[PDB]
Design a protein around this ligand. Sequence first.
Ligand SMILES: CCCCCCCCCCCC(=O)OC[C@H](CO)OC(=O)CCCCCCCC
Ligand SMILES: CCCCCCCCCCCC(=O)OC[C@H](CO)OC(=O)CCCCCCCC
Ligand SMILES: CCCCCCCCCO
Ligand SMILES: CCCCCCCCCO
Ligand SMILES: [K+]
Ligand SMILES: [K+]
Ligand SMILES: [K+]
Ligand SMILES: [K+]
Ligand SMILES: [K+]
Lengths: 106, 106, 219, 103, 103
Amino acid sequence: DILLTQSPAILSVSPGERVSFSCRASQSIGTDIHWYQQRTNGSPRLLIKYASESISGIPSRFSGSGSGTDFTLSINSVESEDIANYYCQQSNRWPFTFGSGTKLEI
Amino acid sequence: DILLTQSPAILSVSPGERVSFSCRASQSIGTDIHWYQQRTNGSPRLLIKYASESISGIPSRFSGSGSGTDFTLSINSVESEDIANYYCQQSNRWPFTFGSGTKLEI
Amino acid sequence: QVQLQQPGAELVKPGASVKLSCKASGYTFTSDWIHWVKQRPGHGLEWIGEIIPSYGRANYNEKIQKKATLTADKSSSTAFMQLSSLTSEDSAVYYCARERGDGYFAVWGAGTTVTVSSAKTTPPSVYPLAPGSAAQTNSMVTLGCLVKGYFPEPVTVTWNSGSLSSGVHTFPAVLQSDLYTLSSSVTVPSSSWPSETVTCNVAHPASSTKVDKKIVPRD
Amino acid sequence: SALHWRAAGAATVLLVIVLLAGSYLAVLAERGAPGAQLITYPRALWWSVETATTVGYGDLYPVTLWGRCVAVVVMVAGITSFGLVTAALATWFVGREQERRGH
Amino acid sequence: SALHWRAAGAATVLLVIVLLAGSYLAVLAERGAPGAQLITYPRALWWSVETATTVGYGDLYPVTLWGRCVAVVVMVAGITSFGLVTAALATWFVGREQERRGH
Ligand SMILES: CCCCCCCCCCCC(=O)OC[C@H](CO)OC(=O)CCCCCCCC
Ligand SMILES: CCCCCCCCCCCC(=O)OC[C@H](CO)OC(=O)CCCCCCCC
Ligand SMILES: CCCCCCCCCO
Ligand SMILES: CCCCCCCCCO
Ligand SMILES: [K+]
Ligand SMILES: [K+]
Ligand SMILES: [K+]
Ligand SMILES: [K+]
Ligand SMILES: [K+]
């Protein structure tokens, strides 16, 4: 089973600054990583698919990069609405697994 | 030759609690890992085959999981009869090898 | 429209079992898989299992104790998860999600909050929170509603049937003596109240109740 | 049209059906097996093609009994289908040579 | 029935025998070689099939001299057997075209 490590667990940034979330896979998974945003009391929401593919409806502010074992979710110019927990998830091997999540603080 | 690491060597748990034994392989061996139970003065007894497959006659209490290099043998609600030494064994590459064993203490 | 509909909550007595449902709408394909994910309060997402409606095959997370059994009804486009012999460890929000067979969860349900307790269901008492006659106001005024004595979680609080969103704060519930209590805050221009009405709507899924409480100035 | 051409066309249609069915069945057979990679439809379709042509890069392959059975069906269908095209070409060539010889 | 059809059937039976024998012999040849993976019968049978069809994913393969010799026999048997099916199909097509031409 693939272990997804998201560290650090909390990211503190100032308004308008660029932030990057990290997700490291225990083994090479190509670009089979997806990112979700979950705000307080809300359900997860897909942000990026297959490491870098945009999702319609998501602010251009969000982007993703990486392949193999190292992945990054980046937010250009963070704002209040971005405050939430962010999780990565892999679909390269069965079973699908989730990272432990990173909280964005402003 | 594949090295199977079983750590810790001794696991202390309270009655009825869930316990998990670890077996880490030096290289990826898919799901070719098998678990054996050996009570004091007894011969080994097969508990789980191919990482998660049940063996007829073994209490549903026992289950296995994992693939690649990390494997786990779990006992749901431990009881006295479970006190024994537990060993993992791989059959992915020649020669077959055994882990060093983990003792269950209550 | 909502693609996956799940009941808001389920109260279950320890040892007993419950069947969660997830009604799906929108486009449906033979390659669709319905997944179930568990999330304990304050913790991460844990994959429980999946089922492919077009065939009825289900797979489960091998790392955890199997508490669920998945089934699906093609005619009603509904997926089900039977959780049995539950304990407090099983108390959590359970989400259903849809995967088009390509690896990611395009859409999620709102989740069903499952609480495993012996306590009894209790609808909440909603009281208004208006300033005292000695309270001075600025360009804004703060009102609210107290929701206490309910069980189990959760309750959804909205203002003016949801039309009033900005300036709203709903605090996390506090548990005491087998009953929850929370308050919600709303701030509007002082010149707009009470000329323009302000009412809080409180929904308690577990008791199938939803009540309104208009916020008017004190006598 | 002649039999060999009809058979070739039919073989092509049948192969396409097997590739699509094989891809669906492969995912069905492989999900649930820890470590399996043939678990999403787009890449399973790609796997079915490189298997039917017998290319087998090794980027994807089945690890379960039923997935492997599905694989054998895909292999045989591809091999037989392409072989049938060869047989049809030979028939076409043989006929043309007979004519060219005035036989 | 005609020769080509009898030969095809026979080839199929012989191939099945070679796959089974090859699987048994492969395990026999490979156990004893440090690092070898073609060492249990179920996966050795799977290996024999992906070798006979010449797919060769690379998930399994022989590392010893005798295992490789067994492998070559399996390869040749598969290639020749499927090739024979192609030859039988061509014969069937040729015969049908001759008739269709009233020759
Ligand atoms: C001596 C001659 C060879 C005999 C081989 C044994 C009989 C074949 C299968 C037994 C299945 C089982 O109980 O095991 C399935 C296995 C479970 O761990 O996983 C597997 O995935 C092994 C699959 C082998 C696929 C073969 C495909 C052939 C078209
Ligand atoms: C110049 C032309 C090529 C000549 C090659 C040498 C002759 C062939 C084999 C010698 C065996 C030996 O003493 O070595 C076996 C080796 C031992 O380490 O292991 C091996 O597994 C190598 C096996 C090679 C398999 C070839 C199969 C052909 C059907
Ligand atoms: C061609 C083999 C039958 C189709 C696959 C069935 C899989 C059932 C679930 O394991
Ligand atoms: C086809 C080659 C002979 C069969 C394998 C013999 C192995 C003997 C032990 O090494
Ligand atoms: K190959
Ligand atoms: K290869
Ligand atoms: K390879
Ligand atoms: K490789
Ligand atoms: K090949």
